[PDB]
């Protein structure tokens, strides 16, 4: 039994290695320590200083260097006793200060223990290297085990969700959030894998197979991750009342369409582009008019056309086969690629103007190329691009567009194609796997946590808006659960949210929506409306001292400065009607769907923001009906390196993600809640007349306490556990046998 076999890899890779002793004694020491910032500017960098003396009010300690300093006991960051180094739950620490928390995390990461609980959360730090704890044998071990019976692992929380589901006859949710490259996706895939195994394969296969299809089209190499998810997702894993997988459904959000037409240096476009160009038969290429990526504008601009340790051709085979599995007819497959192909060509169109001011097409090659694969009409396309008829009152007149404008329209078309296509694939897949008549589900949410970049635009507001809601959800959740526990033993975000989504008074989005109806409004009208309503008027809002295009929002994670550029266009997400027209006629069977199906070609008249808001509310509604599970995925550094855990990088995430807050709150009450028997077995020796093994654990606990003369205000007799305030258990742990 691996859990019992100290030689098992389970032990090796999931546990702190255990020696031959239980004995409290080993850990004996006289030294006390504190965590101090050896540089008060750089406050996340801490060093451990031994307390060489104390006053009634402060402590005096020596630094690394031998530099004595002093601190107020109240400002002190007491170091937990070494026995606590490596605990599986931060809820077990007595001193619950930030440096303390990072240290426990760090001690673990140094032994390659990437999973740690913090109360309700499962903290997962990216290892940036392989750790073989996701095997089938690894799976087998988590089966039916309680949180407390096994080591922290993603499989563990997935097991608990599954049992709870079966046992409470209640739907479940796993919310996996954090920074780009933190490993949300990786964990997400593990949760599914696990469920597929405990509860499962034909459907299973298709279910599994759906992923790769989505990652090809929705994932790309960015500077933060080689396989970044450019869309958020909610996976609903469906079960029948017997606890077997009955189906699945996928909800996608915020796909980054812009990446299609543009990519930052060293980044790539979505994977599919390269896989196609790489894995397409020499005879498929021809039919498709394809060359190397270098031959395409949409792919030859970033400098990067390949990912190390990645074969696009091998990957393409893998994508194609996945589609094969799920059920895309070859016919389908073709058009998909044809679309990918068409899109490529569209990007290759060079607009020229000088004949006038309005643009023209000297070379119809790329144009012809695109139209062909799309099955649309080149002359209609051509016109639709440079000479759209536009409603100007009563009259409908063809406008002759310049290059820029012409070029931007072409781009808009590309992005609609891509977005709609993505949508369609999602639909197609749900069709296959999805259940009308399902009994229970476990939904997995894999999306970014708060985003605070150099530049923050409309998308960051959206994501950060979702994030305030999820944080408020946690908070409420924590509240109820903390109350129950306390109860079982006889012992805001609204303002931000409103600023964003308020109706009356209007919040940011309502203002944006308002501005949206006016063909001639501008970024400047928009930002001015915003400041007019909120500058010095809304406590969560900040009008910048000098920038005229930005504004600040005080979020849960702190202030975020947004820039308004293009918001009006993003909100409306315009496409010339003639292009729709053009494409609505397409002779391609997949193409006609993207444009003829309202569920695909349209919103609801509603804006992008209104749609975002609505989908977030549905999401929350669903979540509200589940028993939730929280996973905080943490990136260790910004360099994609193993064995390199940077306190500043780390601390900042724990600050933003709700981990440290959860603890600060929890710290104020009775953080340590131990089982009577558990307490006694380790401390019996501290009092006179206590056998490790006592039938009356509670009485026994009182003896030690009393023997020790602990301050009764510091502890709390629960019906089954002893509750201890912060520091208490440490002191205790610090007592003589
Ligand atoms: N447990 C893990 N073991 C090994 N590698 C991992 C693990 N978690 C993540 N990784 C590695 O880190 C990379 C990024 O993980 P990933 O799950 O894709 O991050 P993410 O949070 O989904 N990023 P993003 O989609 O861009 O927001 C992976 O491709 C692996 O290189
Ligand atoms: Mg991801």
């Amino acid at each position: 039994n691996p859990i019992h076999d100290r030689t098992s890899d389970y032990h090796k890779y999931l546990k702190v290695k255990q020696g031959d002793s239980d004995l409290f004694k080993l850990t004996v020491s006289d030294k006390r320590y504190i965590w101090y910032n050896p540089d008060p500017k750089e406050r996340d960098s801490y060093e451990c200083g031994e307390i060489v003396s104390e006053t009634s009010d402060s402590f005096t300690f020596k630094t690394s260097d031998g530099q004595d300093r002093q601190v107020k006991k109240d400002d002190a960051n007491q170091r937990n006793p070494i026995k606590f180094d490596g605990v599986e739950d931060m809820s077990e620490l007595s001193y619950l200060n930030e440096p303390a928390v990072f240290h426990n995390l760090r001690v673990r990461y140094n032994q390659d223990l990437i999973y740690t609980y913090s109360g309700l959360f499962l903290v997962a730090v990216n290892p940036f290297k392989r750790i073989p704890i996701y095997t089938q044998e690894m799976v087998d071990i988590f089966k039916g085990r309680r949180r407390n019976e096994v080591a922290p692992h993603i499989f563990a929380i997935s097991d608990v969700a599954y049992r709870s589901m079966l046992d409470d006859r209640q739907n479940q949710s796993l919310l996996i959030t954090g920074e780009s490259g933190a490993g949300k996706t990786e964990n997400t895939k593990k949760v599914i894998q696990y469920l597929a195994s405990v509860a499962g394969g034909v459907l299973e296969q298709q279910i599994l197979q759906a992923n790769p299809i989505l990652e090809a089209f929705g994932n790309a190499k960015t500077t933060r991750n080689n396989n970044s998810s450019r869309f958020g997702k909610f996976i609903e894993i469906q079960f029948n009342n017997a606890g077997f997988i009955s189906g699945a459904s996928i909800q996608s959000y915020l796909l980054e369409k812009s990446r299609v037409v543009f990519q930052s240096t060293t980044e790539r476009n979505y994977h599919i582009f390269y896989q196609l160009l790489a894995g397409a038969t020499a005879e498929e290429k021809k039919a498709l008019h394809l060359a190397g990526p270098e031959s395409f504008n949409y792919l030859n601009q970033s400098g990067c056309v390949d990912i190390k340790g990645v074969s696009d051709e091998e990957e393409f085979k893998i994508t194609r086969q996945a589609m094969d599995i799920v059920g895309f007819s070859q016919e389908e497959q073709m058009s998909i690629f044809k679309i990918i192909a068409g899109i490529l060509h569209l990007g290759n169109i060079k607009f020229e103007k000088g004949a006038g001011e309005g643009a023209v097409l000297k070379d119809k090659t790329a144009l012809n190329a695109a139209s062909t694969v799309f099955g649309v009409n080149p002359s209609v396309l051509e016109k639709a691009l440079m000479e759209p008829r536009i409603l100007a009152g009563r009259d409908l007149v063809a406008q002759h567009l310049n290059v820029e404008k012409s070029s931007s329209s072409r781009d808009a078309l590309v992005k609609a194609l891509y977005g709609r296509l993505f949508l369609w694939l999602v639909k197609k897949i749900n069709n296959v796997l999805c259940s009308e008549r399902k009994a229970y589900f476990i939904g997995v949410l894999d999306i970014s946590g708060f985003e605070i970049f150099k530049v923050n635009s409309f998308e960051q507001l959206c994501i950060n808006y979702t994030n305030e809601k999820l944080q408020q959800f946690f908070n409420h959740h924590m509240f109820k659960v903390e109350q129950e526990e306390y109860l079982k033993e006889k012992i805001d975000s609204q303002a931000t949210i409103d600023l964003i989504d308020g109706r009356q008074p209007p919040g940011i989005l309502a203002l944006l929506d308002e501005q949206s109806v006016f063909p001639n409004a501008t970024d400047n009208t928009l930002i001015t409306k915003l400041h007019s309503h909120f500058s010095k008027k809304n406590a969560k809002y900040e009008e910048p001292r000098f920038s005229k295009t930005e504004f600040g929002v005080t979020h849960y994670a702190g202030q975020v400065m947004y820039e308004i550029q293009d918001w009006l266009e993003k909100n409306k997400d315009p496409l010339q009607q003639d292009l729709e027209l053009c494409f609505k006629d397409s002779s391609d069977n997949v193409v006609t769907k993207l444009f003829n199906d309202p569920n695909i070609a349209s919103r609801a008249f509603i804006t992008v923001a209104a749609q975002y808001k609505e989908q977030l509310a549905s999401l929350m509604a669903t979540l509200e009906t589940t028993n939730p599970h929280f996973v905080r995925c943490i990136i260790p550094n910004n360099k994609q390196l193993p064995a390199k855990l940077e306190d500043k990088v780390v601390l900042d995430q724990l600050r933003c993600n709700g981990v440290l807050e959860g603890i600060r709150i929890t710290r104020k009450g009775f953080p340590n809640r131990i089982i009577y028997a558990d307490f006694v077995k380790r401390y019996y020796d501290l009092a006179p007349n206590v056998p490790r093994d006592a039938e009356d654990s509670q009485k026994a606990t009182d003896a030690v306490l009393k023997h020790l003369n602990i301050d009764p205000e510091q502890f709390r007799f629960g019906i089954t556990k002893i509750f201890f305030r912060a520091g208490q258990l440490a002191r205790i742990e610090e007592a003589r046998e």
Side-chain angles (χ1 to χ4, degrees), residues 1-38 40-61 63-66 69-71 73-282 284 286-307 309-313 315-349 351-352 354-356 358-436 438-479 481-484 486-489 491-588 590-604 606-638 640-643 645-647 649-691 694-705 707-735:
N1 194 329
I3 296 91
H4 305 103
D5 183 10
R6 283 189 188 167
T7 54
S8 60
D9 278 10
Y10 162 81
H11 266 275
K12 212 86 122 14
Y13 296 118
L14 296 160
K15 313 284 318 191
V16 168
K17 196 166 177 81
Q18 296 162 76
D20 299 344
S21 201
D22 275 88
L23 318 202
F24 182 86
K25 192 198 214 214
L26 316 171
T27 48
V28 184
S29 190
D30 329 59
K31 283 111 242 170
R32 277 230 296 194
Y33 299 93
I34 32 93
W35 288 120
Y36 70 86
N37 283 138
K41 58 307 199 148
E42 282 337 89
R43 75 131 151 193
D44 282 346
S45 154
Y46 299 74
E47 212 85 36
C48 169
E50 161 184 2
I51 289 168
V52 292
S53 108
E54 60 176 86
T55 97
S56 4
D57 243 88
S58 101
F59 300 98
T60 307
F61 64 90
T63 61
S64 206
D65 334 291
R69 274 144 120 111
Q70 274 152 90
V71 221
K73 290 181 177 180
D74 269 77
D75 294 321
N77 287 320
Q78 269 196 295
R79 192 199 157 166
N80 287 287
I82 207 50
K83 171 303 258 185
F84 299 83
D85 285 3
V87 305
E88 305 181 333
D89 191 339
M90 308 273 195
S91 295
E92 293 185 49
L93 310 171
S94 186
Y95 301 130
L96 293 129
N97 57 74
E98 284 180 18
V101 176
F102 176 67
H103 180 58
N104 185 249
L105 200 72
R106 163 189 258 168
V107 174
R108 301 193 37 100
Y109 193 81
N110 283 346
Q111 291 172 96
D112 292 348
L113 304 164
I114 61 163
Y115 294 112
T116 319
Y117 294 120
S118 193
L120 300 170
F121 298 115
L122 171 58
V123 189
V125 190
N126 204 329
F128 277 128
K129 69 162 179 174
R130 285 78 252 168
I131 295 174
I133 54 166
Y134 302 116
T135 49
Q136 181 71 48
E137 304 71 50
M138 281 281 172
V139 171
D140 292 346
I141 305 151
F142 289 82
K143 302 145 23 166
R145 300 238 170 186
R146 301 213 146 245
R147 192 160 125 161
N148 81 93
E149 303 153 61
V150 283
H153 196 292
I154 186 66
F155 282 173
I157 54 105
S158 306
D159 196 76
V160 173
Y162 185 70
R163 289 326 139 177
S164 281
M165 181 191 61
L166 296 173
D167 303 345
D168 294 342
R169 315 308 285 187
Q170 191 178 14
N171 299 312
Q172 313 282 313
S173 60
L174 275 71
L175 283 74
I176 310 172
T177 66
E179 297 199 22
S180 178
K184 297 175 294 294
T185 298
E186 283 314 326
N187 283 275
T188 287
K189 290 159 171 162
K190 289 315 88 124
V191 160
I192 312 240
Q193 156 203 341
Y194 183 89
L195 289 174
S197 155
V198 303
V202 199
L203 226 189
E204 297 80 342
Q205 266 321 270
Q206 304 168 299
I207 282 177
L208 301 173
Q209 278 301 293
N211 182 259
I213 291 185
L214 292 190
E215 294 204 344
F217 289 80
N219 283 38
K221 158 190 212 236
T222 79
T223 55
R224 303 122 142 311
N225 189 155
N226 290 177
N227 177 50
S228 188
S229 325
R230 303 275 103 201
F231 64 105
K233 65 237 111 298
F234 193 57
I235 309 220
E236 219 184 77
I237 297 303
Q238 299 173 355
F239 301 84
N240 59 26
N241 41 296
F244 301 122
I245 293 184
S246 30
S249 217
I250 298 156
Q251 234 290 38
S252 67
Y253 304 99
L254 236 16
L255 168 76
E256 177 183 79
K257 294 164 289 152
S258 51
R259 167 172 306 267
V260 177
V261 305
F262 170 88
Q263 325 81 36
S264 327
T265 287
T266 60
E267 298 219 346
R268 292 215 302 190
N269 203 326
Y270 293 98
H271 304 311
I272 180 72
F273 285 111
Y274 311 84
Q275 303 181 176
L276 175 52
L277 285 206
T281 191
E284 266 174 83
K286 130 174 258 137
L288 276 222
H289 302 65
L290 306 153
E294 46 289 324
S295 301
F296 297 105
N297 257 323
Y298 283 169
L299 307 180
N300 72 8
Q301 42 164 295
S302 75
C304 178
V305 323
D306 68 47
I307 316 168
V310 178
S311 145
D312 313 280
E313 332 80 41
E315 282 306 334
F316 189 51
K317 311 153 156 149
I318 295 216
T319 299
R320 264 215 265 216
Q321 183 193 210
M323 304 200 239
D324 269 345
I325 297 169
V326 175
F328 288 87
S329 66
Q330 304 294 305
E331 165 139 284
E332 279 172 350
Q333 302 191 30
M334 214 351 86
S335 348
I336 285 163
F337 300 140
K338 260 185 222 158
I339 295 185
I340 293 304
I343 285 184
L344 281 174
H345 287 317
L346 280 194
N348 265 13
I349 284 161
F351 290 105
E352 320 179 34
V360 217
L361 238 36
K362 290 177 58 219
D363 196 344
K364 299 197 61 218
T365 318
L367 161 69
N368 291 318
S371 5
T372 304
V373 291
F374 298 126
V376 303
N377 204 8
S379 328
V380 188
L381 189 36
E382 203 201 347
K383 296 154 139 357
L385 289 164
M386 311 171 271
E387 276 198 84
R389 294 174 290 171
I390 278 127
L391 208 219
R394 262 235 261 124
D395 351 349
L396 171 89
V397 220
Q399 311 303 348
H400 193 165
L401 301 187
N402 69 30
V403 159
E404 170 242 276
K405 267 177 213 261
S406 268
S407 177
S408 297
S409 177
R410 177 263 302 283
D411 280 0
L413 160 81
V414 156
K415 304 176 298 157
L417 286 164
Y418 206 80
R420 293 169 193 203
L421 161 60
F422 194 81
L423 235 44
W424 183 89
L425 290 158
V426 180
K427 286 195 49 174
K428 282 301 277 82
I429 296 175
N430 274 344
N431 275 192
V432 180
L433 334 143
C434 186
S435 256
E436 307 99 290
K438 56 124 215 308
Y440 304 90
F441 67 89
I442 293 178
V444 191
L445 176 74
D446 156 38
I447 60 155
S448 149
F450 292 94
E451 292 188 338
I452 321 212
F453 304 153
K454 266 40 242 137
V455 184
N456 313 288
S457 195
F458 185 59
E459 297 79 16
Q460 282 66 59
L461 178 66
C462 279
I463 208 35
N464 290 342
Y465 166 40
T466 292
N467 277 285
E468 294 284 341
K469 276 195 156 172
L470 305 169
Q471 182 64 48
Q472 175 180 52
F473 177 81
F474 181 74
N475 279 332
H476 276 306
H477 186 64
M478 193 195 182
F479 184 61
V481 152
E482 276 291 83
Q483 253 189 245
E484 293 184 21
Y486 270 46
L487 174 60
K488 310 220 196 82
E489 308 253 330
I491 300 180
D492 65 24
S493 323
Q494 195 63 48
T496 301
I497 293 177
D498 292 334
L499 169 59
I500 301 169
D501 75 10
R503 265 259 252 224
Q504 276 291 352
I508 300 159
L509 307 170
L511 305 171
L512 160 72
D513 275 352
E514 181 141 56
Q515 291 268 300
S516 294
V517 193
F518 300 88
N520 312 317
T522 71
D523 299 341
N524 174 255
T525 52
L526 177 58
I527 194 68
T528 307
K529 194 130 225 241
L530 296 191
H531 290 326
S532 196
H533 283 70
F534 310 120
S535 175
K536 293 311 219 165
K537 298 169 177 167
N538 188 303
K540 299 290 190 186
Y541 190 89
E542 161 132 49
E543 174 178 1
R545 277 204 291 162
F546 324 100
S547 185
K548 264 82 176 107
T549 40
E550 288 170 18
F551 70 94
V553 179
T554 305
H555 282 279
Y556 173 88
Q559 188 175 73
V560 179
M561 275 292 170
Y562 302 91
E563 148 217 74
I564 222 80
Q565 170 141 327
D566 307 322
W567 286 29
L568 302 160
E569 180 159 41
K570 286 175 208 267
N571 203 32
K572 305 137 76 217
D573 192 35
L575 177 82
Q576 275 303 349
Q577 158 80 180
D578 284 354
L579 291 162
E580 294 297 30
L581 294 186
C582 186
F583 285 86
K584 267 164 147 174
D585 290 336
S586 195
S587 80
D588 179 84
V590 172
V591 187
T592 322
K593 285 298 270 202
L594 301 192
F595 289 82
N596 286 115
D597 177 352
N599 302 300
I600 300 182
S602 286
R603 284 183 321 260
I606 83 165
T607 61
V608 170
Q611 165 196 252
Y612 193 86
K613 182 171 170 185
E614 177 191 82
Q615 315 181 334
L616 168 58
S618 321
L619 165 55
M620 304 297 308
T622 296
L623 298 175
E624 217 62 59
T625 72
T626 65
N627 168 39
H629 314 269
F630 307 90
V631 181
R632 301 335 214 202
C633 291
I634 315 301
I635 207 171
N637 58 76
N638 297 312
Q640 306 180 230
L641 295 178
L645 185 84
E646 292 177 9
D647 22 274
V649 181
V650 182
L651 275 156
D652 177 45
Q653 291 171 87
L654 302 180
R655 253 173 233 123
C656 305
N657 80 352
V659 168
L660 293 195
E661 191 214 39
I663 283 170
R664 147 197 111 68
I665 273 151
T666 258
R667 164 136 212 190
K668 325 247 138 337
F670 281 96
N672 314 137
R673 310 154 186 180
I674 325 293
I675 296 301
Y676 294 102
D678 287 25
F679 182 86
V680 189
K681 156 187 222 172
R682 185 187 177 76
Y683 294 115
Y684 72 103
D685 57 282
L686 308 169
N689 258 259
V690 205
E695 213 211 355
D696 207 338
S697 294
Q698 241 195 84
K699 185 152 82 193
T701 290
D702 195 6
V704 202
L705 295 197
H707 182 86
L708 289 195
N709 186 225
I710 306 309
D711 165 21
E713 224 308 88
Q714 299 329 97
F715 58 77
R716 215 105 319 160
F717 280 102
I719 269 63
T720 97
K721 321 157 177 158
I722 182 50
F723 280 43
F724 280 105
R725 326 256 240 168
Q728 199 43 104
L729 216 210
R731 290 202 233 92
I732 277 172
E733 167 67 17
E734 286 164 349

